[PDB]
């Protein structure tokens, strides 16, 4: 019912306003889905500025799904200014 080690932390992700999260979320999900199974993605928001904190959390539904995403996306360039870094959230 409940899984373990399926949560992963992502760093180096675009810091954008809240209204632009839906688009980015769908884009990142489509990307990560290529390598692993994605269940839910969260974009923590900074109350002070109304923008994302730059990092996010990804629930993959299973352990090996989270590890295949980390292995495939860690240290990769999302774009010019952004380079993603992933690791399992203990």
Residue numbers in the entry: 72 to 161
Authors' account:
The largest of these factors, eIF3, is a multi-subunit complex consisting of five stoichiometric subunits in yeast (eIF3a, b, c, g and i). One of its large subunits, eIF3b, serves as a scaffold within eIF3 as it interacts with several other subunits. Here, by using X-ray crystallography we studied the structure of yeast eIF3b-RRM and showed that it corresponds to the canonical RNA recognition motif. The structure is composed of four β-strands and two α-helices which are arranged in a β-α-β-β-α-β sequential order.
Two different truncations of the N-terminal domain of yeast eIF3b were designed based on homology to the published structure of its human ortholog. Crystals of the shorter truncation (rsidues 76–161) diffracted to 2.6 Å. However, they were not easily reproducible as bunches of needles were obtained instead. Comparison of the relative orientation of the monomers between eIF3b-RRM76–170 and eIF3b-RRM76–161 showed that chain B in eIF3b-RRM76–161 has been displaced by ∼9 Å relative to the same chain in eIF3b-RRM76–170. Therefore this dimer is most probably an artifact of the crystallization and not the functional unit of the protein in the solution. This is in agreement with the gel-filtration profile of the protein showing that it eluted from the column at a volume corresponding to the size of about 10 kDa (data not shown).
